[PDB]
């Protein structure tokens, strides 16, 4: 059972606002909804989306080579932007 | 004004209260009363609004009529045109027409009035069509304007085409409105009107009808679809070969019929942009054949199709024109001679005169493409052929070639183009005279022909009695 | 003699008066007579009503919309400059017509909009509300209860509704009753006098005194300082020193050792006062706050005095024969003192093996009710202290079994136990494993299903339906609750309980709930019993 | 509803217009319905701008980087000109709208009249124009700020000058500047800043080696992690999770 | 990081914090000793905060003399109570923990690292934004 | 699983229709988004040993305008496609008048047939794809911004106005799956509209090379 090149996968509720999903409550408010998300220490991407019930819009990884081979150079541009910004502003320090 | 049951009752009440007592309270009670309005609200209105007007109630009734039209549209979209909803809408429209002489009734008729047996009677009653003929697209827009408004648009369409031709020598919204007010019978009437306009104009109306049909097929069209696709392919790539091959295959696999192929060929022939694209494609095919060195082959089939399209307007209920392979080879022999002269330069006259004497749209297009020692000899032969032809389309192509030569900026070529433009302005009508005046205003960059060009423009304005020629002479005098 | 009008027949009296007595240059009179240049507005409204009948909606919705539009137009162009003048001038026909037909929301809307002018109109509206069989169902405004008759009648209707309903009505309509019986303190005092006479009447006196207790509590968080006033209504005002000391202690909201020695000394006596001054629940709430706190250790010089005061408050009885006490009991206050003293020592030493070894004796004390809810609120404070969950063996089994034993021993503590459990379930604890939080919520549901087994089933299923409708929790938690409830229930079934447990049972993955039952089919038998009942 | 009550500047509330604006101002606003049409058009434009902002920021964050601190220029203009905003305003909302539109045409990043150039210019200063129109909405000027005309056009000159200083000069060594400006926080930030946790937490191992492999992307990173989101009730249920 | 990087060193930072503490009552001789070291001083003595019984100035007055230009800012102290913000006394600080400066005059607030250091939107940062960089340099020197 | 297979085939047809719509071929709304249950009623829910199977659900879709060039898709029964089978497919393009074809291989596609498709690509253009890469969509991702392929007139006026050339323009690799999804040949320019955190929107320009 399962897919290949994947180790034991953890799950959690993202307490942080950006990672937990946000909906537009119709009065005009951004409401952050906490919901169970998964995290694989062994990435098998596009196979994780070949599997059922997964969100294709919100699925993102921490590698660069595979998303270069699949999602393209502008996508890995935005992804490396997000990852490097996260790593630098982990301690709250801002960079431009 | 409008005389409904309530209007007649109000008129009778006014006539009865004009005299014979008619006290205020009893007269008001016998004349009018508000069923929806509460008596307490009616009593409190005089003490608060100071005899307020019923305009707020009228605006509320107008909003309720708009909401009723929206509910009728919702019912027609949910039940798929329910019979009970359609009957209720027709009854409401008839009541509104009987009461008010009718914005809500017109809105209801425009929202849902399909197959109105009483809608026909309502149109016959409002056969004047001051505002309702344009407001009611269901009745007035759909076959109501076929008798008179269609002819008025056809005359305005011809005027717009003439104005566009004048602007080119010096529509879309109407077609979109005609397509919006279109049905099966409306499309049949529009096709008949386009055929009549094409027969009257000798090709301009056919080109306009073909353009309108192509525009509808691009947006809201629904062998006509294949013809529209072929026309769109030709417009996208006039020099393209796949679209031409598809059109030739469709023409080959199109069975003979009663006037349908004749009308399609007539549109393809007297389509001006289509004619220019076909001439450009024929010139490209001739250039490719000359490059390959395999002259006689789809070029002969394309030339035969162009000749059949040209003859479809001349003769009705015809199949096509003769091929004439020997004549095509004789015509292409001057092209081979011109190519040999160009090769000799980079390393005849009797045939050109014969081709100019013969009436040929393909020959005129070849002369226009050529205009746009051996080369010098071929150029005088091409000029002689153009002078022997002396057609309006040939004159327009010669004006385009003269503009191209002026853009090229050759001295001797400029002098020859100025002489040809003067001859064409002398021979042709006031439009050709104005074109020659513009070509002479752009001409005479050298000082040896500038005063001569001004004298020729003055002599053409004086001898040309046309108002366009006089305006061109005045513009030339003002410019220089 | 003008004859120039199209729809001016509505203003016919004014037009006739203007035509009769215009004189000079009647240009303005002619303009007023010919102002209605449009067609007959009433006939156009009748035609619009006929069109609405022929259209989609042939109902009275159009008439209701027209009445609402007329009321909105009146509210917009309300002549507030001379509304009082017009009302006090005429006051008969407009008020009479409004009360006869348009008494839905027009008068109440005008009163709640301004309520300062139009004294005659306000009096007419009050008279109409009094003459109506339903007493003031139109004028329910917190600032419009400044009239004695209207406020007394609204108080009568609200008290009748509360007494007709009961507990399930008590958790719903008491804020909207308290919002006008606590709006003005003079109205509060009048209501206190009325229902104090009602409590002096013996039958229903317990329920009335409970209403007085909760109104006094609501006034306490609202901002009233009516503890001395409640004491004045009570018999404790007969003794001036006792009344002054008790009022000062209630106003302070804490416990004073010198003042409580004074209370002990006027107590422990051969002629005790009537017990209600120590039976008032706000004073016992002060003892709850001061005594069984996890912190705030008392000096324990008068510890026996505190414990004896609690024993006298929660133990002794009396027989009121013609408002005279001649038979009292004092044999249970010693055991109550021993239990409360043991619990106070447990709260003082606050330590876990010895805590369990004394938890056995603590359960033996939990058999007492005052001990039970003191331990309940102590557990509430201890768990509600943040970062309490840093070590678990069965998701705080000692305190959660204290909850179970309290619910088992006393059925009346179920609302407070439910409030604590739903507060703990609503609070999200961070800095913990997601699976550990999941199992903690599961164990909270285990305790609340224990409450369902003890019989607080209608509010438990109600809270499940409420928390599933709003702030949707985990489907695994809902499935686990449903599976355990079907495990613990058995036929016969009450139709109300089946109806309350229905939609939660037939939504949200019944096939997901069915995992490994096999021997006993919970949901299939529930379907069979529901179809047999309904 | 809060956006409407904060940015509509409703003209029907005559008492509100008497308190906010002068008598000539309210009578001119009520007389000229074209002014009310311009305010309604501005309100529709800023509603579309609110939709654009909710598109560009799906996250509920209102902090952004901008060349100007417009609240501070409002405060400075107020305390320079001595507004005393207890008194009603003396500036017309139509003057506010024409001033903010004139400034919006004043600032330029891409020159030329190519439609491509104009589209690029508008996409470049799209967010900043939205922010400045949001701050310069007529309701906030008339109610909350109440600046005079001299304060208003002096403010417009100050904003134009500050943005003109805020443009980027050409020829600056931006690439080496950026490489250094990212290298320095790497020097400040520590690889030992990760103090781990009781749970595995997927072994985030951010820091110096993480930034290392981001600088030179390795085909086999030390911890290639993937974050997975589900669609619906599958994630809502822990059992389906 | 669009932040100031000059900052204020630790000793002068702690000293100016104790100087901007609310209860500073400074003798006339000491104020006399202090107001030579302002380079950008206008040359006129300011009014003392206390006039009777004795002429006493205050540290906020002296810092208002220090600050050139007219800058408006609000900053929060490191020990500022958010519940004090939420409830009453939001404009009358019991602990003087709301750094408020208006028109080049320091109204209230105990200056700290969060108000004077490398923090974004700091007083020296907005000073370098508004008036001259040389003026801000003189401001640093006068402070020191 | 039979249900998994029919769900996969439904998603394959759905993404093929969406691909054709985004590419610019005339696709009706019902095929653009039809229900999985509607497709099951259409074809029979049983791809395994049943009346629906491969090549049965192929489409021949014409362009929005100029319908002379039309695309059509191949679904070989074999997992690993055969060169003889793609030669039979070549015979099908020969008997058709259209030159645009796509191939869907269940497993890896043979390098001999890869070199073959490289060989006969200029005469008629054939593109191969894999089940997962056309089972999932790429433009639906929030990480992926908007892509529009620009035409030659826009390219010429762009280079004229910015005074730069095609080598100076930043490139995008031709074998990238974005370019494979959009069907873009060598040296062709695509604009990208991307959401910009500091400026709202950005318009960047890339060249498939």
Swiss-Prot record, chain A:
Q: Coiled-coil annotation: which residues?
A: none
Can you summarize the PTM annotation of this record? Answer: The tandem heptapeptide repeats in the C-terminal domain (CTD) can be highly phosphorylated. The phosphorylation activates Pol II. Phosphorylation occurs mainly at residues 'Ser-2' and 'Ser-5' of the heptapeptide repeat and is mediated, at least, by CDK7 and CDK9. POLR2A associated with DNA is specifically phosphorylated at 'Ser-5' of the CTD by CDK7, promoting transcription initiation by triggering dissociation from DNA. Phosphorylated at 'Ser-2', Ser-5' and 'Ser-7' of the CTD by CDK9 (P-TEFb complex), promoting transcription elongation.
Q: Can you state the subunit structure given in the record?
A: Component of the RNA polymerase II (Pol II) core complex consisting of 12 subunits: a ten-subunit catalytic core composed of POLR2A/RPB1, POLR2B/RPB2, POLR2C/RPB3, POLR2I/RPB9, POLR2J/RPB11, POLR2E/RPABC1, POLR2F/RPABC2, POLR2H/RPABC3, POLR2K/RPABC4 and POLR2L/RPABC5 and a mobile stalk composed of two subunits POLR2D/RPB4 and POLR2G/RPB7, protruding from the core and functioning primarily in transcription initiation. Part of Pol II(G) complex, in which Pol II core associates with an additional subunit POLR2M; unlike conventional Pol II, Pol II(G) functions as a transcriptional repressor.
Q: Which family, according to UniProt? A: Belongs to the RNA polymerase beta' chain family.
Please state where this protein is localized: Nucleus; Cytoplasm; Chromosome
Write down the superkingdom of origin: Eukaryota
Placed within the complete protein, the shown segment runs 1299 to 1394 of 1970
From Swiss-Prot, chain B:
An example GO BP is:
cell population proliferation
Name the Pfam families for this protein.
Answer: COBRA1 (PF06209)
> Where is it localised?
Nucleus
Q: Mention one GO molecular function.
A: RNA binding
Q: In which tissues is it expressed?
A: Widely expressed. Expressed in heart, brain, lung, placenta, liver, skeletal muscle, kidney and pancreas.
In this UniProt entry, the residues modified to N6-acetyllysine are: 453
Name the domain of life. Eukaryota
GO CC, sorted alphabetically, is: cytoplasm; NELF complex; nucleoplasm; nucleus
What are the protein's UniProt keywords? Acetylation, Nucleus, Phosphoprotein, Repressor, RNA-binding, Transcription, Transcription regulation
Q: Does the keyword Transcription apply?
A: yes
Subunit notes for this chain? The NELF complex is composed of NELFA, NELFB, NELFCD (isoform NELF-C or isoform NELF-D) and NELFE; the N-terminus of NELFB binds to the NELFA:NELFCD subcomplex. Binds RNA which may help to stabilize the NELF complex on nucleic acid. Interacts with the first BRCT repeat of BRCA1. Interacts with KIAA1191. Interacts with NELFE.
PANTHER family membership:
NEGATIVE ELONGATION FACTOR B, NEGATIVE ELONGATION FACTOR COMPLEX MEMBER B
Into which family does the record put it?
Answer: Belongs to the NELF-B family.
Q: Under what name is this protein listed? A: Negative elongation factor B
Give the source species. Homo sapiens
UniProtKB/Swiss-Prot annotation, chain C:
Q: What outcome is documented for mutating residue 367 to Q in this protein?
A: Reduces RNA binding
Coiled-coil residue windows: none
Task: Write out the entry's keywords from A to Z.
Answer: Nucleus, Repressor, RNA-binding, Transcription, Transcription regulation
Any Gene Ontology CC annotation: nucleoplasm
| Impact when changing residue 322 to M | Reduces RNA binding
Name any one GO molecular function.
RNA binding
The protein's location, in the record's own words, is:
Nucleus
The protein's matches in InterPro entries, at most eight in alphabetical order, are given as: TH1
Biological process according to GO: negative regulation of transcription elongation by RNA polymerase II
The region annotated as signal peptide is: none
Q: What is the reported tissue distribution?
A: Widely expressed. Expressed in heart, brain, lung, placenta, liver, skeletal and cardiac muscle, adrenal, thyroid, kidney and pancreas.
Q: State a single Pfam family of this protein.
A: TH1
Q: How does it assemble?
A: The NELF complex is composed of NELFA, NELFB, NELFCD (isoform NELF-C or isoform NELF-D) and NELFE; NELFA and NELFCD form a stable subcomplex that binds primarily through NELFCD to the N-terminus of NELFB. Binds RNA which may help to stabilize the NELF complex on nucleic acid. In vitro, the NELFA:NELFCD subcomplex binds to ssDNA and ssRNA in a sequence- and structure-dependent manner. Interacts with ARAF. Interacts with PCF11. Interacts with KAT8.
Instruction: Give the protein's function.
Output: Essential component of the NELF complex, a complex that negatively regulates the elongation of transcription by RNA polymerase II. The NELF complex, which acts via an association with the DSIF complex and causes transcriptional pausing, is counteracted by the P-TEFb kinase complex.
Which family does the similarity line name? Belongs to the NELF-D family.
**UniProt protein name:** Negative elongation factor C/D
Swiss-Prot record, chain F:
- Asked if the record carries the keyword DNA repair, the reply is no
SUPFAM superfamilies, sorted: Eukaryotic RPB5 N-terminal domain, RPB5-like RNA polymerase subunit
- List cellular component terms (GO): cytosol; nucleoplasm; nucleus; RNA polymerase I complex; RNA polymerase II, core complex; RNA polymerase III complex; RPAP3/R2TP/prefoldin-like complex
Point out the cross-link Glycyl lysine isopeptide (Lys-Gly) (interchain with G-Cter in SUMO2) in this chain: 80
Query: In terms of one coarse class, where is the protein primarily found?
Result: nucleus
Among Gene3D superfamilies, the record links this protein to:
RNA polymerase, Rpb5, N-terminal domain, RPB5-like RNA polymerase subunit
Answer yes or no on keyword 4Fe-4S. Answer: no
GO biological process terms, semicolon-separated: protein stabilization; transcription by RNA polymerase II; transcription elongation by RNA polymerase I; tRNA transcription by RNA polymerase III
In alphabetical order, the GO MF annotations are: DNA binding; DNA-directed RNA polymerase activity
**UniProt entry keywords in alphabetical sequence:** Acetylation, DNA-directed RNA polymerase, Host-virus interaction, Isopeptide bond, Nucleus, Transcription, Ubl conjugation
The listed locations are: Nucleus; Nucleus, Nucleolus
- Disulphide connectivity of cysteines: none
Family matches, as InterPro entries: Arch_Rpo5/euc_Rpb5, RNA_pol_Rpb5_N, RNA_pol_Rpb5_N_sf, RNA_pol_subH/Rpb5_C, RNA_pol_subH/Rpb5_CS, RPB5-like_sf
The entry assigns this protein to a family as follows: Belongs to the archaeal Rpo5/eukaryotic RPB5 RNA polymerase subunit family.
Q: What is this protein called?
A: DNA-directed RNA polymerases I, II, and III subunit RPABC1
Organism of this sequence? Homo sapiens
Mind giving the lineage of the organism this protein is from? Eukaryota, Metazoa, Chordata, Craniata, Vertebrata
């Amino acid at each position: 059972q399962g897919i290949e090149q994947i180790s034991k996968v953890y799950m959690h509720l993202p307490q942080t606002d950006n990672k937990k999903k946000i909906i537009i409550t119709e009065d005009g408010e951004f409401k952050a909804l906490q919901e169970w998300i998964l995290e694989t220490d062994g990435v098998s991407l596009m196979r994780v989306l070949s599997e059922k019930d997964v969100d294709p819009v919100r699925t993102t990884s921490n590698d660069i080579v595979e998303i270069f081979t699949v999602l393209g150079i502008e996508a890995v541009r935005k992804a490396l932007e997000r990852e490097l910004y996260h790593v630098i502003s982990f301690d709250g320090s801002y960079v431009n | 004004g409008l005389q409904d049951l309530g209007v007649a009752n109000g008129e009778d009440l006014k006539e009865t209260l004009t005299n014979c007592t008619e006290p205020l309270k009893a007269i008001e009670q016998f004349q009018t009363e508000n069923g929806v309005l509460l008596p307490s609200l009616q009593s409190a209105l005089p003490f608060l609004d100071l005899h307020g007007t019923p305009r707020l109630e009228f605006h509320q009734s107008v909003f309720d009529e708009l909401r009723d039209k929206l509910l009728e549209r919702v019912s027609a979209i949910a039940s798929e045109g329910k019979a009970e909803e359609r009957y209720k809408k027709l009854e409401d429209l008839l009541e509104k027409s009987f009461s008010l002489v009718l914005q809500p009734v017109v809105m209801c008729v425009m929202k849902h009035l399909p197959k109105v047996p009483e809608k026909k009677l309502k149109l016959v009653m409002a056969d004047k069509e001051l505002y309702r003929a344009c407001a009611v697209e269901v009745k007035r827009q759909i076959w109501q304007d076929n008798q008179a408004l269609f002819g008025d648009e056809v005359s305005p369409l011809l005027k717009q085409y003439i104005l566009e031709k004048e602007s080119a020598l010096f529509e879309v919204v109407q077609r979109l409105t005609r397509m919006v007010g279109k049905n099966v019978k409306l499309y049949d009437m529009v096709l008949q009107f386009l055929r009549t306009l094409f027969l009257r104009t000798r090709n301009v109306h056919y080109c306009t009808l073909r353009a309108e049909l192509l525009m509808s097929l691009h947006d809201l069209d629904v062998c006509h679809k294949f013809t529209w696709c072929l026309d769109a392919c030709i417009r996208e790539r006039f020099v393209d070969s796949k679209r031409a091959r598809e059109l030739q295959g469709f023409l080959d696999g199109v069975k003979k019929g009663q006037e349908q192929v004749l009308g399609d060929l007539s549109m393809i022939l007297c389509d001006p942009f289509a004619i220019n694209t076909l001439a450009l494609s024929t010139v490209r095919h001739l250039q490719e054949l000359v490059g390959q060195e395999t002259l006689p082959l789809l070029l002969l089939l394309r030339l035969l199709a162009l000749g059949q399209g040209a003859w479809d307007m001349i003769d009705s209920q015809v199949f096509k024109e003769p091929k004439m392979e020997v004549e095509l080879i004789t015509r292409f022999l001057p092209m081979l001679m011109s190519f040999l002269v160009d090769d000799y330069t980079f390393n005849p006259e009797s045939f050109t005169k014969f081709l100019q004497e013969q009436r040929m749209a393909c020959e005129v297009g070849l002369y226009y493409v050529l205009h746009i020692n051996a080369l010098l000899r071929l150029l005088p032969g091409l000029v002689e052929t153009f002078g022997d032809l002396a057609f309006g389309d040939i004159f327009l192509h010669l004006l385009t070639g003269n503009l191209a030569l002026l853009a090229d900026e050759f001295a001797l070529e400029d002098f020859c183009s100025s002489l040809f433009d003067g001859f064409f302005l002398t021979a042709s009508p006031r439009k050709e005279n104005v074109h020659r005046h513009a070509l002479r205003l752009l001409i005479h960059l050298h000082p040896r022909v500038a005063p001569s060009k001004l004298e020729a423009l003055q002599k053409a304005l004086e001898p040309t009695g046309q108002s366009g020629e006089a305006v061109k002479e005045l513009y030339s005098q003002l410019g220089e | 003699f003008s004859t120039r009008d199209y729809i001016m027949e509505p203003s016919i009296f004014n037009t006739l008066k203007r035509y009769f007595q215009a004189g000079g240059s009647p240009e303005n009179v002619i303009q007023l007579l010919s102002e209605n240049y449009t067609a007959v507005a009433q006939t156009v409204n009748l035609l619009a009503e006929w069109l609405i009948q022929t259209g989609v909606e042939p109902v009275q919705v159009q008439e209701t919309v027209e009445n609402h539009l007329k009321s909105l137009l009146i509210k917009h162009f309300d002549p507030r400059k001379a509304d009082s003048i017009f009302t006090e001038e005429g006051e008969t026909p407009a008020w009479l017509e409004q009360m006869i037909a348009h008494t839905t929301w027009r008068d109440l809307f005008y009163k709640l909009a301004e309520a300062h002018p139009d004294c005659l109109m306000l009096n007419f509206t009050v008279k109409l509300i009094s003459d109506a069989g339903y007493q003031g169902e139109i004028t329910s405004v917190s600032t419009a209860c400044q009239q004695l008759e209207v406020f007394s009648r609204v108080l009568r209707t609200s008290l009748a509704t509360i007494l007709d309903g009961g507990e399930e009505n008590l958790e719903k309509n008491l804020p909207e009753f308290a919002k006008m019986v606590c709006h003005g303190e003079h109205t509060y005092l009048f209501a206190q006098a009325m229902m104090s006479v009602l409590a002096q009447e013996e039958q229903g006196g317990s329920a009335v005194r409970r209403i007085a207790q909760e109104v006094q509590r609501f006034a306490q968080e609202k901002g009233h300082d009516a503890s001395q006033i409640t004491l004045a209504l009570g018999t404790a005002a007969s003794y001036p020193r006792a009344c002054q000391a008790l009022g000062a202690m209630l106003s302070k909201g804490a416990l004073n050792p010198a003042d409580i020695t004074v209370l002990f000394k006027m107590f422990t006596s051969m002629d005790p006062p009537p017990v209600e001054l120590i039976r008032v629940p706000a004073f016992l709430d002060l003892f709850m706050q001061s005594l069984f706190k996890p912190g705030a250790r008392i000096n324990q010089d008068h510890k026996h005095k505190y414990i004896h005061i609690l024993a006298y408050a929660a133990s002794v009885v009396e027989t009121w024969k013609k408002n005279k006490r001649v038979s009292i009991n004092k044999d249970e206050l010693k055991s109550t003192s021993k239990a409360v003293e043991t619990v106070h020592n447990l709260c003082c030493n606050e330590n876990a093996s010895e805590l369990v070894a004394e938890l056995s004796t603590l359960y033996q004390c939990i058999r007492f009710p005052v001990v039970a809810m003191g331990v309940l609120k102590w557990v509430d404070w201890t768990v509600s202290e943040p970062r309490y969950f840093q070590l678990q063996t069965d998701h705080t089994p000692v305190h959660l079994a204290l909850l179970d034993e309290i619910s088992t021993c006393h059925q009346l503590l179920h609302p407070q136990v439910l409030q604590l459990l739903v507060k703990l379930f609503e609070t999200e604890h961070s800095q913990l494993d997601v699976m550990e939080q999941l199992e903690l919520k599961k164990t909270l549901l285990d305790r609340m299903v224990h409450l369902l087994s003890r019989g607080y089933v209608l509010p438990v299923v109600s809270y499940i339906r409420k928390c599933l409708e709003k702030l949707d929790t985990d489907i695994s938690l809902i499935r686990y609750f449903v599976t355990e409830v079907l495990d613990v229930i058995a036929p016969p079934y009450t139709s109300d309980f089946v109806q309350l447990f229905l939609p939660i049972l037939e939504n949200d993955s019944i096939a997901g709930t069915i995992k490994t039952e096999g021997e006993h089919d919970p949901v299939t038998e529930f379907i069979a019993h529901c179809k047999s009942n309904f | 509803k809060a956006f409407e009550k904060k940015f509509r500047f409703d003209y029907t509330n005559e008492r509100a217009l008497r308190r906010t604006l002068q008598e000539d101002l309210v009578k001119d606003v009520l007389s000229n319905a074209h002014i009310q049409n311009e305010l309604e058009r501005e309100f529709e434009r800023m509603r579309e701008d609110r939709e654009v902002l909710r598109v560009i920021f799906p996250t509920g964050d209102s902090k952004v980087v901008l060349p100007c601190n417009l609240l501070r220029m409002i405060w400075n203009a107020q305390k320079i000109f001595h507004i005393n905003p207890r008194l009603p305003s003396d500036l017309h909302p139509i003057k506010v709208v024409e001033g903010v539109k004139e400034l919006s045409k004043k600032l330029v990043i891409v020159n030329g009249d190519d439609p491509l150039s104009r589209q690029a210019q508008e996409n470049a200063t799209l967010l900043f124009n939205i922010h400045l129109r949001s701050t310069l909405c007529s309701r906030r000027m008339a109610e909350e700020f109440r600046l005079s005309g001299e304060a208003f056009d002096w403010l417009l000159g100050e904003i134009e000058s500050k943005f003109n200083q805020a443009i980027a000069h050409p020829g600056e060594m931006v690439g080496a500047l950026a490489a250094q400006s990212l290298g320095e926080p790497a020097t400040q930030m520590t690889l030992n800043t990760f103090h781990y946790a009781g749970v595995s937490a997927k072994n985030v191992t951010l820091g110096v080696p993480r930034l290392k492999e981001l600088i030179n992307i390795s085909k086999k990173p030390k911890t290639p992690s993937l974050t997975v989101f589900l669609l619906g009730q599958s994630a809502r249920d822990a059992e389906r999770a | 990081s669009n932040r100031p990087v000059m900052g204020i060193v630790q000793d002068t930072l702690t000293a100016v914090r104790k100087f901007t503490k609310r209860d500073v009552f400074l003798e006339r001789g000491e104020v006399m000793n202090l107001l030579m070291f302002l380079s950008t001083w206008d040359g006129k003595v300011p009014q003392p905060a206390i006039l009777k019984p004795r002429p006493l100035w205050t540290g906020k007055q002296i810092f208002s003399l220090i600050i050139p230009g007219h800058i408006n800012c609000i900053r929060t102290h490191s020990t500022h109570p958010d519940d004090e913000d939420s409830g009453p006394y939001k404009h009358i600080s019991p602990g003087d923990t709301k750094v408020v400066v208006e028109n080049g005059e320091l109204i209230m607030g105990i200056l700290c690292k969060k108000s004077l250091g490398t923090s974004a939107g700091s007083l020296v940062h907005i000073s370098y934004l508004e008036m001259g960089h040389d003026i801000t340099r003189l401001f640093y020197s006068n402070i020191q | 699983d039979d249900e998994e297979e029919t769900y996969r085939l439904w998603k394959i047809r759905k993404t093929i229709m969406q691909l054709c719509h985004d590419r610019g071929y005339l696709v009706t709304q019902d095929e653009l988004d039809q229900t999985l249950e509607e497709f099951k009623a259409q074809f029979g829910d049983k791809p395994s040993e049943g009346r629906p199977r491969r090549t049965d659900l192929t489409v021949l879709v014409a362009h929005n305008d100029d319908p002379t060039d039309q695309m059509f898709v191949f679904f070989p029964e074999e997992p690993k496609v055969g060169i003889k089978t793609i030669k039979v497919y070549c015979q099908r393009m020969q008997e058709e008048n259209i030159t645009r074809a796509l191939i869907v291989v269940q497993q890896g596609m043979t390098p001999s047939a890869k070199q073959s498709l490289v060989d006969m690509a200029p005469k008629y253009i054939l593109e191969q794809f894999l089940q997962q890469e056309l089972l999932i969509n790429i433009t639906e991702h929030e990480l992926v911004p908007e892509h529009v392929v620009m035409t030659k007139e826009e390219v010429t006026e762009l280079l004229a106005r910015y005074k730069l050339r095609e080598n100076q323009l930043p490139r995008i690799q031709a074998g990238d799956p974005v370019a494979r999804y959009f069907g873009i040949k060598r040296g062709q320019v695509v604009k990208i509209i991307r959401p910009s955190e500091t400026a709202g929107r950005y318009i960047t320009y890339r060249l498939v090379q």
